Design a protein around this ligand. Structure first.
Ligand SMILES: CCC1=C(C)/C(=C/C2=NC(=C\c3[nH]c(/C=C4\NC(=O)[C@H](C)[C@H]4CC)c(C)c3CCC(=O)O)/C(CCC(=O)O)=C2C)NC1=O
Ligand SMILES: CCC1=C(C)/C(=C/C2=NC(=C\c3[nH]c(/C=C4\NC(=O)[C@H](C)[C@H]4CC)c(C)c3CCC(=O)O)/C(CCC(=O)O)=C2C)NC1=O
Ligand SMILES: CCC1=C(C)/C(=C/C2=NC(=C\c3[nH]c(/C=C4\NC(=O)[C@H](C)[C@H]4CC)c(C)c3CCC(=O)O)/C(CCC(=O)O)=C2C)NC1=O
Ligand SMILES: CCC1=C(C)/C(=C/C2=NC(=C\c3[nH]c(/C=C4\NC(=O)[C@H](C)[C@H]4CC)c(C)c3CCC(=O)O)/C(CCC(=O)O)=C2C)NC1=O
Ligand SMILES: CCC1=C(C)/C(=C/C2=NC(=C\c3[nH]c(/C=C4\NC(=O)[C@H](C)[C@H]4CC)c(C)c3CCC(=O)O)/C(CCC(=O)O)=C2C)NC1=O
Ligand SMILES: CCC1=C(C)/C(=C/C2=NC(=C\c3[nH]c(/C=C4\NC(=O)[C@H](C)[C@H]4CC)c(C)c3CCC(=O)O)/C(CCC(=O)O)=C2C)NC1=O
Ligand SMILES: CCC1=C(C)/C(=C/C2=NC(=C\c3[nH]c(/C=C4\NC(=O)[C@H](C)[C@H]4CC)c(C)c3CCC(=O)O)/C(CCC(=O)O)=C2C)NC1=O
Ligand SMILES: CCC1=C(C)/C(=C/C2=NC(=C\c3[nH]c(/C=C4\NC(=O)[C@H](C)[C@H]4CC)c(C)c3CCC(=O)O)/C(CCC(=O)O)=C2C)NC1=O
Ligand SMILES: CCC1=C(C)/C(=C/C2=NC(=C\c3[nH]c(/C=C4\NC(=O)[C@H](C)[C@H]4CC)c(C)c3CCC(=O)O)/C(CCC(=O)O)=C2C)NC1=O
Lengths: 66, 162, 149, 160, 160, 162, 160, 162, 162, 160
């Protein structure tokens, strides 16, 4: 397993930012497996929408080698 | 997220109208259920561990292949992930029951869960069965009205995962 | 392909923030070559670049191995959150993580905290925050950041 | 609202609500009915509130509707009173919610930038909200006046 | 305490307490005398509650005092009853506090590691606190039994 | 932090004692004063901006050199920091009065404040007179008993800074 | 295994394997036949070890097979011995790999919350694995029994 | 990542079985080839810089247009990226040969490499030719058996790219 | 950190000297005690939980005040913190024994530990007593041969605190 | 060293050393005697090694000792052979340590910056280290020659 590829939008509700922020609104990122629960929890907390995540590196169902 | 009151506020704001009689009736209806919801939330908080205990026991009794070698729940790691997921489902359905609205389930549970499980190869039908099992287990502990209220959010979760 | 110089400037600023200075003698560029390649290709964001530098063996030798866990908490908080250790609760939390899980879960606990997400998000390299709150954060942070390596 | 804030606070630590937090929610749902009556009273008398608040504002600040002012003109005065109507609706929303959260997340974030784009003077908005508070508290009883004026004071501070 | 929780939440947001939190404080301060009555009633039945709860626990879990159990013997049973007495005192503290905070910083943080080092079974602790719940709620009126069972349930969930 | 209730609880926990008649008496005293405390906190919160207005005005009237060029409160930024510090002191004094205890003052205000200001060349004595200005303004608004109450925490901050 | 751990270590700092890493790989492959025949011996004798370890377990701690015990009844005892068979297989995998990495990945990561979900006492698991260690090292020669012992001690320390 | 031993362990753990005769045979096969792999890896590490030197020389001699203006490798930056990519391929082929398994290759080199090179404009066939040049130099260096071993993983990389 | 071998290496590197007979003698001494150190470390790894159990039990039996109300180890949080400190001490003393050098002790344990304990009010004498209890239990388990060596690092830690 | 690397890798995980790490340390300390014999052999013939390696290097690279070469003259040739002596001593240190750590901190970290500050061609250093590797491996048996050649190859790669 060991890697997810995450595409999520994170809208802004607290403030309208003076900087562009179109670094951080729509993005695709590679996140390692043990990271994803906390990461997805974070994007959910700031109100973002998870558009897709994919397996890239490993194979599902592996018992070791993860 | 948004609760029942905030849901009414949004549905009247997007149309730009003041609260009419129907909005006040909906708010009164939500306030009436508040004590029942708080009692049910307290009961589930007290017994969340046991609910997960016996719901996971029922799920792995009905599908023993899940926890045997070759199953998706076969390892201490993957069994731990399965029971963590069931615990999060119970706690978030409890949040939704308290709020009176399913927005928290969409924003913080179903937001990317379907296709995360698809990527991991998690069997969706067995997850639905586990959610149903937690539904009967919670209903037994919370009684009739609270069980109907929790069953609403449990069925919402089951539909979202399905 | 474009804005290569700006992006390399960002990479070297990240090195200077995580390791407090330039680490050319330690051949830091070739150690993190694949990481830099991923960050150029926009496969990863700045936060994961910082996470890979702060969880590296070089970082561990520079700032984890030489010091007791309390100094480890305050040093990694200086490098990754821009401030000194905040209160006793934070010291307890990171001390427990260091005692039970070790160095890498400690770094990821700092980096996955809500505070990092609010202050630095996923795109900006951390910096000294000159925190006004809470009490004693400002002078402790100034003492830490007025110190050479 | 208060329930949402409590749920978010608990989800921050990934825990069920404490008994004290559930007691807080019990108190909120106990005060819900009186809040509903207060918001009912405010929403029934919205027309008179808007009329009196606009008249009081324009008499205190004649330059707004005088030639050269932003509010001069029939359509512009209508837009002014429409803004007052928006803010009254938001105050009612905040009263039922028990917190200033709906008020802020419809009409406080970016309000300075919007009114800067609209040439709308902020002290004029503050005075409009103050006159509107005076009228609303006049129509309400002694007990309701305190919490109703609370949201108006929050809105005025947001504009100021 | 309830006041402490309100102040801490307000401080996290760097604001004064809202009228909602002040109303919550007024409610708790109004319920203080009933809370003190409940705490006195539990405190006076200290020994009866501990004795009956120990009896029910040991009959429900005979293996705890059976050979090979953590509570085997007279002195380990005395330590068991001492632990129950600690938690009863903590429950009275939580009742007067109006929330489960003192229970948390005295008996819930690190209890897992402590009882692991003591090889004390946590489930047996859970049946012990449930037996305490039954006994203590038996001596109170239904209304007071509700809040007391709330704290006992927080303790049972924290140990479980 | 710590309040009066938590103070009694901690005193009896260090002794390992169930509550006595003296503990119940202290708790009843705090519950008796809770309503006055809430009224003082509410009237302070409603008028905090005004209190800062007047306190800063009096401080900069008595000590003009603070806001003359080269003074520690001479820039828009440093003046803003000055009034922000005064609002900090007012808010935490309100917290302490509502709690009935000064532990929050030591924990979240005074800890490192003297050397914070000494590392910045902030005049500590001038800050103390700003605090007495806030004391005098607040006392006139909250009423005599609440004035004597708020004075305890204002003097606590003044003595900790001095 | 040894090879995977060395490779991931070298890939962490983007280098080829150091002379020490190559030396440890050579040491691992040189000892492969010995650890492999050890895996033989532990593999053909799975049933004797499982049943002897279960007997020793139930003798040392009788609460588990007693009323209120986790293994009370025939089916729970069968599952208990099934878990021992699992862990003996994991030990064989660890012996062939040269590290405990399969042991974490299959049966150590998350074992705490799994057994907590099963009402399974970790001290009982430690007793089980120590019984299995004694029985297994009985069947091996001194050098082989020692190296099997280190894997069993690691399993005991990780379990509780 | 998986080596041969972890691959066998995973198969026999997904099937929930102890090692049978065939698994022990595979483990002996891996162990017997271990010293060959260690010597070949040490040889490659000793001559990694030389291997990349000569491999890039052959690549840019057979296809000189790559480094002339208009070629994908025409810049100091793009030439550096080309030789660094060749470094990556050699190092990871050494990792794969030492593990005895190709999971590290596709896991940490090949996922998205075709897509990335197509997005960048990197010619796939030229990179394949460069990998083949690395293959020839490494094979002429290490020795016949080690040459075949490295050729397996070099061919895996070439097949993955094309 | 520094061990015996790296200590000899550093000593001879500062002098710019190749290894002479005395250096080889010290290296032989460490290589001769290596197997004993490894056996002791393995035993301590096997029985660390039991060591901490028995050491804490002995310390709290000799000083019952520490875990009774009013003691620095009276609460669940402070009891867990005490056990965590003793776990630190055991693990790092094991590291120092396996290294044959006390440098890791200075640079990961003792630096600032007295200041931390004095800030928190942790009794230094009772921590030293707990370290002696760990010393006795560990020496009993490791055997007479390694007990003397292990006591050196436990005594180093105790003298560093006291 | 090997032991130091195992200890730091264990401390990074806040754990005790694994069975594999303990096997690594046992293997390292068991082979310490042959490591010391190899280091003694290299130390005894250091002068011969340096002279022969200098001859080979200046034969393969005559430009270094030709006018304009970085090692032209008596003092620069002395400094060149002095650097070769430094690296031979570091290789002996690596032999006794069982890893290339002392080599790394004493003469690898910063080496490119140093020889750049010294107009010293790195290909010249690589050729000199290869020459010294051949001369040294000539004086040892095959089993020891491979191990020392691995340290020399690490040094050559670092200078490359
Ligand atoms: C620097 C280059 C850049 C641009 C220009 C850009 C556009 C942009 N505008 C946004 C917000 C927005 N923008 C608009 C404006 C649109 N809707 C109205 O109908 C108008 C017709 C129209 C503007 C002309 C609105 C309404 C939102 C709020 C959307 C929401 O979050 O609900 C957002 C979401 C992030 C945020 O809320 O700050 C983006 C990404 N993004 C970039 O990275
Ligand atoms: C906060 C809301 C939320 C949830 C609940 C969530 C679930 C979730 N489950 C995961 C893995 C998993 N989830 C399961 C559970 C399944 N396996 C069993 O068969 C059952 C049928 C079923 C559960 C009832 C398992 C076994 C895994 C591990 C899969 C693997 O690693 O191969 C992961 C991948 C990261 C990790 O393992 O830590 C996530 C993020 N994510 C979220 O953001
Ligand atoms: C619910 C949140 C919300 C708010 C608050 C809001 C305000 C708002 N007021 C507007 C116009 C206006 N608003 C005003 C009001 C000002 N005139 C006087 O100076 C007064 C001080 C003050 C009112 C009390 C005026 C004069 C205009 C006309 C501006 C123009 O057309 O040039 C407009 C431009 C669009 C339109 O005219 O339809 C907006 C968006 N819009 C929103 O979606
Ligand atoms: C105020 C917070 C606090 C708590 C709760 C606390 C508990 C506590 N219980 C202890 C012993 C004990 N505690 C128990 C009780 C357990 N045995 C049974 O199985 C039951 C499941 C369970 C009780 C219901 C027993 C049997 C012992 C004796 C253990 C021994 O002698 O080794 C000890 C060891 C020191 C001593 O006995 O004085 C502590 C610190 N300490 C604290 O500072
Ligand atoms: C160098 C940067 C800097 C600035 C700009 C600054 C402004 C400043 N103006 C002040 C008073 C004042 N400022 C004004 C000016 C206002 N009167 C009218 O309304 C106008 C709209 C407006 C000016 C065009 C007035 C009338 C006062 C007296 C306020 C009072 O005494 O109550 C004060 C209070 C201290 C004092 O009176 O000496 C400051 C600090 N301070 C600084 O360090
Ligand atoms: C390879 C990693 C792995 C492990 C280890 C594992 C253990 C495991 N043991 C289980 C049941 C069980 N396991 C036990 C064993 C306990 N009985 C005594 O108390 C002992 C202390 C202890 C064993 C030594 C018992 C009694 C049950 C039945 C629990 C019940 O039905 O309530 C179950 C639930 C499904 C079943 O009934 O088989 C699992 C998943 N599963 C895995 O995928
Ligand atoms: C526009 C940016 C750019 C540059 C600068 C560039 C340089 C460059 N010089 C090269 C060869 C070379 N470059 C040199 C020059 C050196 N010989 C002596 O040492 C001198 C100090 C020095 C000349 C002043 C030599 C001799 C070669 C031949 C190398 C060989 O055949 O082995 C090559 C290899 C392929 C070829 O021969 O064309 C490149 C790519 N490439 C680029 O895309
Ligand atoms: C370790 C796994 C890994 C690999 C393999 C990898 C390849 C890789 N090569 C890249 C660029 C490149 N790669 C090449 C090399 C190609 N072009 C030449 O013509 C040759 C035919 C051929 C090499 C044999 C070039 C020239 C670029 C620069 C592209 C550009 O900036 O326009 C990039 C884009 C980011 C960057 O420029 O640094 C990646 C991701 N990245 C990885 O993390
Ligand atoms: C690896 C080097 C290192 C060590 C050892 C270390 C110890 C340490 N002990 C602490 C607290 C503590 N430590 C103890 C233990 C002592 N009090 C008991 O009575 C015993 C007599 C005695 C132990 C035998 C206690 C009770 C506390 C809690 C103090 C408090 O919170 O007030 C803390 C504060 C953080 C927390 O409470 O989790 C640290 C950092 N820090 C380091 O960087």
């Amino acid at each position: 397993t060991r890697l997810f590829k995450v595409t999520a939008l994170i809208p802004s509700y607290k403030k309208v930012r003076g900087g562009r922020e179109l670094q951080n609104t729509y993005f695709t990122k590679l996140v390692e497996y043990d990271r994803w629960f906390a990461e997805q929890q974070r994007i959910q907390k700031q109100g973002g929408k998870i558009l897709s995540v994919k397996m890239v590196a490993g194979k599902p169902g592996l018992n070791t080698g993860v | 997220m948004q609760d029942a009151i905030t849901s009414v506020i949004n549905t009247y704001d997007v149309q730009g109208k003041y609260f009419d009689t129907s909005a006040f009736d909906k708010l009164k209806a939500y306030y009436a259920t508040g004590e029942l919801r708080v009692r049910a939330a307290g009961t589930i908080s007290a017994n969340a561990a046991t609910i997960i205990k016996e719901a996971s026991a029922k799920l792995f009794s009905n599908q023993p292949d899940l926890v045997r070698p070759g199953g998706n729940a076969y390892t201490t790691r993957r069994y731990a992930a399965c029971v963590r997921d069931m615990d999060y489902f119970l706690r978030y359905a409890t949040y939704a029951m308290l709020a009176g609205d399913t927005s928290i389930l969409d924003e913080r549970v179903l937001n990317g869960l379907k296709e995360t499980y698809n990527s991991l190869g998690v069997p969706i039908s067995s997850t639905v069965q586990g959610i149903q099992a937690m539904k009967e287990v919670t209903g037994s502990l919370v009684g009739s009205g609270a069980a109907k209220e929790m069953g609403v959010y449990f069925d919402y979760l089951s539909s979202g995962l399905s | 392909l474009a804005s290569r110089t700006e992006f390399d400037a960002l990479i070297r600023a990240a090195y200077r923030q995580v390791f407090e200075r330039d680490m050319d003698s330690y051949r830091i560029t070739e150690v993190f070559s694949v990481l830099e390649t991923k960050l150029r290709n926009r496969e990863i964001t700045t936060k994961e670049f910082i996470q890979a530098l702060a969880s590296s063996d070089l970082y561990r030798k520079q700032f984890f191995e030489p010091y007791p866990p309390t100094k480890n908490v305050e040093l990694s908080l200086k490098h990754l959150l821009g401030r000194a250790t905040k209160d006793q609760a934070e010291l307890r939390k990171y001390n427990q993580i260091i005692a039970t899980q070790g160095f890498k879960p400690f770094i990821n606990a700092i980096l996955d905290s809500k505070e990092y997400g609010e202050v630095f998000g996923d795109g900006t390299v951390p910096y000294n925050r000159y925190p006004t709150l809470p009490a004693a954060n400002f002078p402790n942070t100034e003492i830490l950041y007025n110190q050479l390596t | 609202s208060v329930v949402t804030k409590a749920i978010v606070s608990a989800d921050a630590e990934a825990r069920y609500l404490s008994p004290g937090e559930l007691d807080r929610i019990r108190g909120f749902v106990s005060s819900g009915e009186r809040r509903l009556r207060v918001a009912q009273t405010l929403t029934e008398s919205r027309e008179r509130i808007i009329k009196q608040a606009g008249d009081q504002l324009f008499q205190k600040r004649p330059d707004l509707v005088s030639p050269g002012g932003n509010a001069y003109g029939a359509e512009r005065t209508a837009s002014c009173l429409r803004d007052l109507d928006y803010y009254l609706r938001l105050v009612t929303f905040g009263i039922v919610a028990g917190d200033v959260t709906p008020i802020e997340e419809i009409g406080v974030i970016g309000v300075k930038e919007m009114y800067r784009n609209l040439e709308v003077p902020l002290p004029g908005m503050v005075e409009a909200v103050k006159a509107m508070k005076s009228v609303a508290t006049g129509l309400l009883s002694g007990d309701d006046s305190a919490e109703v004026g609370y949201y108006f004071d929050y809105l005025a501070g947001a504009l100021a």
